[PDB]
Every structure is written in C-alpha cells, then in structure tokens.
Symmetry: C3
Subunit: 497 residues, 3 copies
C-alpha cells in the first residue's frame, strides 16, 4: 500500500526517493529515510549502540585511523612550511603559542621523561612525523609534559569532565535511546570535556587567558538543561564581565586580588585547579536531587564557598546569599512534588493517554511509565503529561538551583528556569491531568472504549527507536561490573553499582 511519501508524491508531482540522493525534496515529503553509515559504539550497550564515523576525532584511541593522502616522514620545520599554505591558521595559532614560541614562555619547568623541554614543541611532537601514521591526541599526550593539570582533569567524579563521555554518554538513556546521528553533538560535547585539553584553552594557541573567560565554558554550560551561562550572565557579575572584558587584564592567574569580576573559572577552577567539580558541595544530578547545602553536615563546603566570595565581599553577605539559595531551592521542590503527585496519580488511575503500552517501548524495551521507578524519564516518545513532568524536574527545578547559585535575581523569580516558570508548568501539568480525567469520566459514563491513537506507538521516527529491538542478553554487564569508573543506575545494568 502507499506510504506517506507515495501519497505526497502523487499530490506534489515529485517522485519518491532516498533522502541522500541530492534531490531537493519539497517540504521533505517524498524523501525516504536512509540509515547513515555507522561504526559500533562502545560501553555497556555496544550490542546496538552506534556512532557516526566522525567519532574518530573525539574517541581517537578506539576509532582513529589514517585518512590522509599526503605521504612522507617530515621534520617539525617541514610540517610548518607546508601547513603555512595548507592550513594557515593552525600554524598561526601554533606560532602564537608557547609550544611554538620561546619568547612567550614563562619558565614553568616543563619536563618530559624527567628532562627539561627546552625546544619548540612542534606539529610532529604532538602528531607524529609520518604523514600516513598521524596521531590524534587525547589528554594522554599532554600528560607527558603536564602531569599536574592532567591528574586533576582526571580526578573528578560522576558528573564531572572526567567521566562525561565514558560514563555519561555511553551509559546515558537519552543517548543510547536515539539514532546515532540525532545525538552526535551529545557525544562530542561530552567527549571534548573528557578526552581533550582544548575545551577551555582551545587549540592551537592553548592560551590560559582565553580559558579564564566565560566563553571557555558557555558553549557547553548553557541551555534549558543547565542554564548556568545565562544565570551568570544575568547576574551583576555577568554584566560586569561584559562591561570590563575589553579592558581588563586576562593575563593574571586566577588568584585572590587579581580580578574584580569573577568568572566560571575564577570560582570553579580556584587557583587554577583543573578538577572544577571538587568545590561543589555534593553532586545532585544538576539540582534534580534536593539537598540543603547550608545544613550542618555540609558546613566545611559552605564555609569554603563563603571564603571564596570573601575575596571580594563580606563573609556575612556571602553567607546570606548562599542561605537564599538554600531557602529558594527548598521552596522550589514543593512545586515539583505537587507536579509528581498529579502525574503519578493519573498513571495509578489509568487515565494517561497514551498509557505506556500505547507508546513505543522505552529504550530498555519496556512499556513502563517514565516517571515511576524503573522507567525512563524523558521528553520524547511519551505522553504529554510525562513530557511536562520531565520539563518540570529537569529544565525548571534544576535551574532554580543554578539561578540562585549564580545570583540571577531575574531567573530566580521571573525568567528561564525560575519560580514563576515552575508555576506556569505546574498549571500546564494540572491542565493536562484535568483534561485526561474529564475525557476518562465521560468515556466511562457513556461506555465508550477509548483506544490510544496508533501514532503514539508507530511512525517513521518512532519505528527507528532501539527499544523495539532490545532482547535478553544484549547488555555488556561486565562494563557495569567495572569499579575503575562510576556508573549510572540503569534499570537493565544487571549488577551492583
């Protein structure tokens, strides 16, 4: 029988065809989805997880291969001469880096194999000399000469740069639950943070002054999921950053008295510490878990933050501000608990449309309510009620904490990820619940047997989801048995974590 594409083709006079053939498809109506070429993904879901081949740049230890057309074994100087023509800005960057320019070195005392590095560190020193065997490095390379910074970069827990990809890409429901090409940016953002040393001070200048700016963090630390850039930017600190950035001295080390305006790096990479997570009171799943950071048991961490603020403030003022955070966060969770009760209530009364058996299976292969134990909280391939619930906990409640932590008066109250956005979301959730209950009450009284629409279960995108093909024995539980990395509490992990 005719597909959507076939019918569209008959109406628009454009033939049906594969999406990838170069045809300009009118509103994409007659194009058929083709699976891109994949490589196998790593981690506990390696039986079905895929990546686009471009993962080569971001997990090079497992995917990098020679793909160059240029042959030869060259000296550093030859790399530079040719790349001056072939990739000019890479050479320009490198010539403006202390690797490539002795004049801007600070005599730090860099050593490799116990011996001082006094020469230029050239293209070949980082990439190899043989153009058919070029290397694409990770922090492993940098460790040869920068062990302190590397050790710190590798010292974080779950929720830090240290495990951003290895755990929080490869084990994460929203990543493993979707076609690889949909979530490439997830893999790369998280992998840049973990596997590279260029997230903050970019290649090839590797300039710490660049790394001190909020621009060194906000590409990743932004948005509806974790809006700390916006929270910072809409604080008075953030406004003063914008005011003073052009004329302030960014060449000063992150130290007490060196800056008027605090940046992300100033407060989180205190005194140049490359394990920024460690200053946090406790990992709270981005504020989705409730904790009072001002409670007696967290006094050491609270006192440490107060002292940090005291670089530029009264400690009494700082203490008050962090207490405002504690209070504002605790109030915010009353609205989440209201929402959760309304949402689970609907499930328990059987009035959610669709019910879980009416949707595509979740990424575990289960027909399980997303906001119950064992479910997969999500914004896609689920009911409107469940979507709104996820938005309430993740996008709003988590960001109230971020708004308070970063002194954004507006976003604590009115703005994105605020108290008032929680209010509005709560109204939306109650509205959905009310509609669902009124439909169910009417249908019961008149004896109409409602069946949820097939579009909740099947469709061109929904049919691509991995939940359909999950089967017993498809989890690499040995991965989850590893104790050298932490793990996510996934329902099908199959072992103790």
């Amino acid at each position: 029988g005719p597909t959507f594409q076939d019918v569209a083709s008959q109406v628009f006079g454009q033939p049906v065809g594969p999406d990838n053939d170069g045809t300009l498809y009118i509103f994409g109506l007659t194009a058929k989805y083709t699976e891109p070429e994949y490589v196998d993904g790593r981690g506990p879901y390696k039986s079905f997880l895929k990546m686009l081949p471009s993962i080569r740049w971001y997990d090079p230890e497992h995917y990098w291969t020679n793909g160059s057309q240029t042959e030869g074994v060259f000296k550093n100087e030859e790399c530079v001469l040719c790349h001056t023509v072939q990739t000019p800005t890479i050479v320009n960057d490198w010539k403006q880096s202390s690797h490539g320019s002795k004049d801007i070195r600070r005599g730090i005392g860099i050593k490799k194999d116990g011996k001082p590095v006094e020469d230029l560190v050239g293209c070949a020193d980082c990439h190899g000399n043989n153009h058919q065997k070029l290397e694409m490095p990770t922090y492993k390379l940098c460790n040869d000469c920068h062990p302190k910074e590397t050790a710190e970069h590798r010292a974080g827990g779950l929720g830090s740069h240290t495990h951003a990809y290895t755990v929080n890409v490869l084990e994460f429901s929203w990543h493993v639950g979707k076609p690889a090409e949909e979530v490439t940016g997830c893999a790369h953002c998280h992998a840049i943070a973990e596997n590279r040393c260029s997230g903050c001070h970019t290649r090839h200048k590797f300039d710490p002054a660049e790394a001190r700016k909020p621009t060194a963090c906000r590409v990743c630390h932004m948005g509806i999921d974790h809006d700390e850039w916006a929270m910072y930017n809409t604080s008075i600190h953030g406004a003063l950053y914008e005011a003073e950035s052009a004329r302030m001295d960014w060449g000063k080390k992150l130290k007490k008295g060196n800056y008027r305006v605090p940046t992300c790096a100033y407060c989180h990479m205190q005194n140049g510490d490359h394990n920024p997570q460690r200053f946090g009171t406790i990992y709270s799943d981005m504020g989705m878990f409730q904790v009072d950071r001002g409670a007696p048991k967290h006094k050491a961490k609270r006192d440490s933050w107060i002292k940090l603020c005291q670089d530029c403030h009264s400690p009494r003022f700082a203490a008050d501000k962090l207490k405002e955070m504690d209070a504002g966060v605790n109030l915010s969770f009353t609205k989440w608990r209201e929402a959760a009760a309304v949402i689970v209530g609907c499930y328990l009364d059987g009035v959610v449309d669709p019910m879980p058996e009416g949707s595509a299976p979740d990424w575990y292969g289960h027909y399980t309510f997303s906001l119950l134990p064992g479910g997969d909280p999500r914004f896609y391939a689920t009911s409107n009620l469940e979507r709104l619930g996820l938005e309430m906990i993740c996008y709003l409640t988590g960001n109230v904490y971020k708004a308070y932590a970063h002194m954004s008066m507006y976003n604590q109250t009115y703005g994105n990820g605020s108290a008032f956005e929680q209010d509005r979301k709560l109204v939306e959730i109650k509205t959905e619940a009310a509609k669902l209950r009124r439909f169910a009450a009417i249908e019961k009284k008149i004896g109409l047997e409602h069946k949820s629409a097939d579009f909740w279960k099947h469709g061109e995108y929904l049919d691509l989801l991995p939940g359909w093909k999950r089967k017993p024995g498809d989890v690499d539980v040995e991965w989850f048995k590893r104790t050298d990395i932490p793990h996510r509490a996934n329902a099908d992990a199959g072992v103790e974590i």
Copy 2:
C-alpha cells in the same frame, strides 16, 4: 495516612525527612518542606508579609544590625590595611575610585555641610569607625555629598526607581501573595533600584563610565516581563554597541555629539539626569495600558523624543519611527481585546475549569476570577485560561511597545514579545476556550456533574499561600492613607488612593 513523601519513601528506600537536614533527597521525593526563619515584612500587608533575614542589606534602615566578629575603633587607613588582606577586591575597587584616589578626581566641587571634601572618602567615612557598629548605607549617605543626583534619584513617580521597593514590592500582589523565599530576588532587584546608588555604577569603583553601558541596566531591565535589553540588543543600535564597545570612549559624558551609539543611559538619563522615568510620555504599566504617544495631547513629549533622536538623525525619520510605534501598539491591542473577550466569555458562561471557587483563594483571600475587576491577574495558582490571558497582556502586549520603542524589527514582528507571538498566544487561548466549551457541552448533554480536581485547590505549594489565612482587619490601611508615596490600586486597600 501516608503523605506523598511517605509513599515515595516506601518505594525508594529513603527515609522521609526535613528538607533542611542536609540529606541528598532522590528527586526531592521524601523531603518535607520546612519554613525558613523569617523577619516581618514592611508595608500595608505587614500583618503577614515576611522577608528572609538577608533583607538587612537592602532595607538597612529597618533591618540592619551588627553581625561582625571583629572589634575595635579604627582610622580609615587601618580599614584599608586589614581589608587589603580580608576583602582585597573591595580595597582595589576603592583605590581605583575617586573617593580613594585624588589623581582621578575632576574637581567637581563636592561639599559636605557646606565645606569642600578635599580628603579621601574612606571605608570609615561611609561605614563608621567602630567595627561593632558598622553602617550599611542607602542613598541617604550619598546625599551628604551628592545632593543633585540623590534628589533626582528620589524624584520619580510610581513605576520608577524611586518607589520600586517601598510601593512596588511591599504593595505588589505577586510579591505579597507568595512565600518570602520564593521572591527574594524581587525584593532585592527592586530595592537595589530604590535604596542604593550602586545599581548602575557599582560599588566600590562607582565609575560613571561603567554606568553609561547597557550592562548598567540589563540585569534588571530584561526578560519576559519587560524585555527592553533584548529589544535594544536586537536593534541596530544594540548591534553597534556590541561592535564598538571595546574601542569607544566611555569616559565621555552623556551629551549630544559625544557618542555614535546610543545606550539606555544616553536616551533615558539624558545629560546625566538621574530621574530617567521623566522622559517617558506617560506611565502605562509597562505597556499593558494602551496610549497613543503620538496624539496631540502628548506633542511636547513626542517632540522631546524627536529632538533626542535628532542628535544622530533627521527629525522626520525619528518622527516616522515613533509613529510606527504608535500604529504597531494600537494594532497589538486588537488581539488582546479578542483574547480578553474569549476569556471573560468563558467565565460568564461558567465553563472555566477550575472556576475560581475550585482554586485556592487569591492573595486577598477571595475566590474571584483573576481577569475581572477586583481579581488578581496572575500566572500561578489559577486556570490555564487565566494563565494564558495574563501572558497575553503582560508578557506579549506590553513587550510589543518595548520592541517598537527600541527599534527591534525582529521582535516587533517574529520574535519574543512580538505580533506573531501574540498571534500564537491568541490561538492557544482560543484552543483552551474551545476545549472547555466542548467538555461542558458534552457533560451537560449526558448529565455528568463535573467537579474540578482537588489539585487545583490543594497541594504542598498551594497550601503555603497567604490567601488561606487572610482575615478581616489584617490590612494596615494607614499605609495606604499616606500621601508622601503613591500606591497600587489593590482591592483590599480599604481607602482612597
């Protein structure tokens, strides 16, 4: 019987407990809300209004107390020596201010008690000499030496910095209607504008050049409620600000011919006037009230704006642009009136779900429709229809004016607070109304007696609202009788305003 927390505890294996004990509560599910420590709030609702104790910094005349552990009576120079170690950036700021540095003084002619201030103005001069009796100032202090700027700062009407807190926090429905810790940022944002002189030129540098930048305004003048920063930033003026900020001379006084790119301060603090409200045609409740600023009766104000624009433009061009504002605003109100008719229509036909008696009482203690006279227009603890109505008038219609006033082509039409967002909101409002009417028609025909869900009336957050505990005689009407400040037209004011 078990609460939500008790049930959650039994399912997740985490004990129920107080939110404030430091436990990391899984999705905040088993945490119980505790009331933070409060102090009494001021104003006409002082019988129940509360503040967090940190209000000490923002309304210090009424809440400031000694809270220091350091004892002694010190000279200015001693303040500096110790704070160089203890709060270094405050000293650095102060040393870079004309208060603390004679070299950057301009010989303005500052006097205290009729005598010239020729000495440094040190920590002790503003905070006192006794470390157990330190003072936290307001504009009252600055008035000692800067009477002109202070008088202007105090010359505004309702809707200006002058009464931002005293009237528009302490009398405002959305503030008084919510638990104190939810709205701390409201109190402080508005109180910084009223009680301080550091909102634009921050302490401790007090640099007018900083105050001239848009960053001196946008922390407060932003967002869905009043998006003028975004309107400015998405105008060509705003783009040119971003382009020229790094290299332009911000040390020039706000004067005709001193700037290529106009900022908030250039247009609103014309010639350094510290009463920025006065250049406005008329107060319109943030554009929620409709007025044609191009009408004959406003000619003097319109001509004054045209002349301001003529610093850098043809007055004919300026006149045309402000006429575009008038026309665009007048069109925008047709959509609001459509929305209002649809919404009130639903109330009058009794089909809103919930009806007002089905919700928690409003902050007056009334079960009154929010979009009728005497009601409390709001986005929280109300029906979806009422929420959308408030969003239509406040967030969108008001911001259409702001988009036109600031020359944002995109936000006048497509963007945030635009004509097209009004369109979409109007569709949402009609959609809600249609759903409500279809449910009511069905329920009438089949004889189903619909009762609005209990979650509209009760819940962990809704139960905290002050409407529940309002009672006769709980308003300080003497406050509203004051003629030395203006007042909001609150339903329970009890007197003439």
Copy 3:
C-alpha cells in the same frame, strides 16, 4: 448592541474612545481600533496591500518626497557646518569615513563617469544640493562609484538580499495577509537588505571593519524563524569571537590566514564577495525543504565548503562535520513527516477544530486547510493543530539545519531549533490530534452536533484580515509574468512562474 468596549466602559468607568486620541486606556479595554493613514503598497497585491508612509525611507524610488522645512541651495561645506549643530553624529560619522576624510583612504581607484574621485564625497554628493529636493538613496547611488560591490549585491537569487523586499515582502503571504502596521519591521528588514548598502557597514562611517563582525548580520539573521546568530554564537567559533573581538585586528580583509576566528562575513562573503548567497549548496527555503548537501550531485559545492574550512582545519575534519550535518538533517525530517501525517490525517478525518470553514478566510480569500496544497501554512488565524505544524516545519526543522551548519552542539540536540525541541513539538502535535479525535468520537456516539466557536472566525483582529475582501480580478498577474525577478509560488498568481 454593546461592543466589548461599551461593556468594559460600563464596568471600569472609562469612556469608550478612539485608540489614537491620547487617552490612557485601562488595559486597552475601552479603546476602539482606528486605521492608521496608509499609502498603497507595490507588487502583485497592490489592489489591497498597504504600507505606513514611513516606507519612504526604504523604497525611496517609489515613495520619497520632500518633507524638509529648511530651504536653500548649499555647498558640501555648508551642509557640514549646519549639520554639525543639527545632526552632530551624522557629521562625526562622515568625518570618520573615507568619503569625508582623505587620510584614511586606501587608494582603491574609485571612479565616477570614468574619472577618478579625488575630492571628498560630501553630504550634497549623495543627497543633492537643494534642501527642498533632497534625495534618499539606494544602491543605485553607490553604483556610480562602487560598481563591483553593487553588481554582486544585485546578483543573488530568490532568498538573497537581492530580492528580499521586491519579491519576498511584496509577494509573501504573511506580509500581504496582515494589516500594514503589524508588519512594518518585515518590510524594513527585508528592504534594508535589498535596497541599501548600509545593512552591514552602517551609515555614515561605512566601515568595512564593522561589516566583518557578526553584529553586521545578527539584527536580521536571528530568531525562531532562522536562528543562525544563536547557532553561530553557541558554537566554539562564536565563543572565540566573543573572547577575541576586543583585541583582534578587524582591519584585515576577509582572506585566508588573516583571521583566527571565522565570522558570518568570513564564511559567506568569502574574499569580500558581496553576493553571499552564492556559496550555499542550494536554496532550500531556510531548510524547510530537504536536501542532502553531501550527495554526489553537490560535490563541487561540498568540496568548496571543505576548502573554506581548510583555512583553519584538516579537510577530513571539515568533511566529517558537514557529513554530520547531512545525517542530522535527514534524521530531523522523519519527525516532520510523522507530524505532517498526524496533522493531515486529522483534516482528512474531519476532526480538526476549527475546520477551515470555521475560521476566517486565508489571505487568498479561501477556506482551505493551511497544510494542504494551495493552503497558506501559518501560525495565526488558524487551528492549534495547524499552528503547531507550522512551528514544527519552520521554527524547528529548518533550524536543525542551521544548528548543524554552524557547529552548535547544544542547539543540534537540546537547544532552540533542535532534535529534542522537535521531539517535544511532535508530542504536542500528537496531543492536540488525540484530544481532537477523542472529542469527535464522544460527540459522534452521543449524537452531539459540534459547531466550532465563533471566535475562530470573527473578532476585532480577525475582522481586519484581507481574506475577507479578496475578490476576482484583484491580482496584478502582470507582476507575476515578469521574468526579470523570480517569484513565489502563490496559489492565486494566475500564471506560470
């Protein structure tokens, strides 16, 4: 009978009156809409299209008239002397331009009528000498001395600056379908791009260094419809722009090796090319039409982009990144096709509320479903289902392409115009469809004959729409017969395009 205004007046004690009389109308409730003064619009819908008179500045060839009060015939030098007082910043700009300052000229070889322009190019040279016959120029003037840049500016196709106004304002459904004052910003934004040479390097400095910055593009190239500024800004390129803008040398020509950080102009006005559209693979209606830019037939364009990226990158890296775009775009269209099937499905089953005959006629004067052939896809004056459909294709699906094209990891996945926003919109669309189907099923079973509410068809804004007054013979089809400009595929064009 009483209107909404009359009833409101009786309730609020404010008389009904015209919106334009200067009265401050309480919530705009008692104000009556008045039609602003219009001039006739141009193009194929000239029989009813209107413009505000301020169109004089933007289509001056057809609308400019003398409106000055100053009389006299003056020399350049006299223009400057008086305007130093009367419009100081225009003179300041001009004195800082190479037109008005020989010292900053670069000896480019500018000629007029085959002769070198060695004098200052003064106010009178561009505006005329007679103050009662002043000229308001377009690119036609600039062509006298800058033929190369003008020819390129005029070399684009549909979707470029070249036809932004002449075709894509005057023929565009959303513009012609709305009252003129609602869409003034549309006319001007598009007309600035087409008719002027000041969109990027603003008057009166006309500084190419300014034009190279992202600020030269983002006022227009922003927002929910086409969010490329945000996509760029949330890429690492964009973060590096913010980091380096203050200290980088913007005086360098856009050339390989002159910049570390690429801007809009660097990538789209390659080597100073003033036809930025031409580097695009193919026009795709802002990504609403699906095309795989990595397909064999587009190899030349793909290779050209790869080489552009190779200014600062491996071509293998660049190739991989553009393949990620291809793959991500192709996945994004599966969700659109799902949405479209759900939406059209509802129309074909007759369950959309309102159905098209229940709404105001579209701008063609038809009662036609907006998401069928011959309909007018839109966000206003339509059903919620149709609104959400338009949002899915235009605001989200189109912007997924923009997110990938500009390397925004976050906006490809989580952010504005992303995969996950598509997910959420798809849930919304299915939710609307489900509600519509459940209502229809109930109403059928109980024998309730549903009539869509009158507010879908009539209202103060809806009644202003041009669809009501469309009639046979009201299209200037001769316009559409023109072959010297391209055309939009409008349903009532009446001829071959």
